[PDB]
Design a protein around this ligand. Structure first.
Ligand SMILES: Nc1ccn([C@@H]2O[C@H](COP(=O)(O)O)[C@@H](O)[C@@H]2O)c(=O)n1
Length: 221
């Protein structure tokens, strides 16, 4: 059977993570954090001294990238070539390099085959920026989760806050907008809602109010 897929795209800080796992737990499907794949790529590009600023060098690393994701059971596990990197892939040096890579056209293509392998029966819940417009433009369900930068920033400042880290708001906002821009305006697989994607807005919708509206969207079809 040709495995069904539901795509969740949108900016950083809209709630694609908790959505994505609330949907893969209730539907009983696999999940794809492809965002965790551009982050690991960069991490391998650091630990391997691979000039992250090199298209010709990033490409080999990307197409050979030895990443893995546990079928889990209650939490997620990001394992690079054999070891959990789940804490390391969320630091400053990485989330930077991550968008310092995704930007590479030839690198997005070298990463195209691994991601799509994430589609299997009973289905697949894909997360990212270009999932419903790139990797899975044939998706029978496409959701675009959006917000406001100010709000989505206000969310990163409390998350960074819930672990005891210095967070000034008036700086992170500009970074959000810093990150957003490069994503909404880069030459390949930019951040932009597929013509058939449901632009869902989570700026004032509770987590419950989001999974409920999306679960209801995927569900008729
Ligand atoms: N589908 C995706 C997911 C992430 N990315 C890229 O990877 C970076 C880190 O992803 P994330 O923080 O969402 O895990 C983003 O800055 C950038 O958009 C992408 O290009 N396409």
């Amino acid at each position: 059977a040709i495995a069904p897929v539901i795509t969740i795209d949108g900016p950083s800080g809209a709630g694609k993570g908790t959505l994505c796992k609330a949907m893969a737990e209730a539907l009983q499907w696999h999940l794809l954090d492809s965002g965790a794949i551009y982050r690991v790529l960069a991490l391998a590009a650091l630990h391997h001294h691979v000039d992250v600023a090199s298209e010709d060098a990033l490409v080999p690393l990307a197409s050979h990238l030895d990443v893995r994701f546990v079928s889990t059971n209650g939490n997620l596990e990001v394992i690079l070539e054999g070891e959990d990197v789940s804490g390391e892939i969320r630091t400053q040096e990485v989330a930077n390099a991550a968008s310092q890579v995704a930007a590479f056209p030839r690198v997005r293509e070298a990463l195209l085959r691994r991601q799509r392998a994430f589609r299997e029966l009973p289905g697949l819940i894909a997360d990212g920026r270009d999932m419903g417009t790139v990797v899975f433009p044939d998706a029978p369900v496409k959701i675009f989760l959006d917000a406001s930068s100010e709000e989505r920033a206000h969310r990163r400042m409390l998350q960074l806050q819930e672990k005891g880290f210095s967070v000034n708001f008036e700086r992170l906002l500009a970074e959000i907008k810093e990150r957003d821009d490069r994503d909404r305006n880069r030459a390949v697989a930019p951040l932009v809602p597929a013509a058939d994607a449901l632009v869902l807005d989570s700026t004032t919708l509770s987590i419950e109010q989001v999974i409920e509206k999306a679960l209801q969207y995927a569900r008729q079809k």
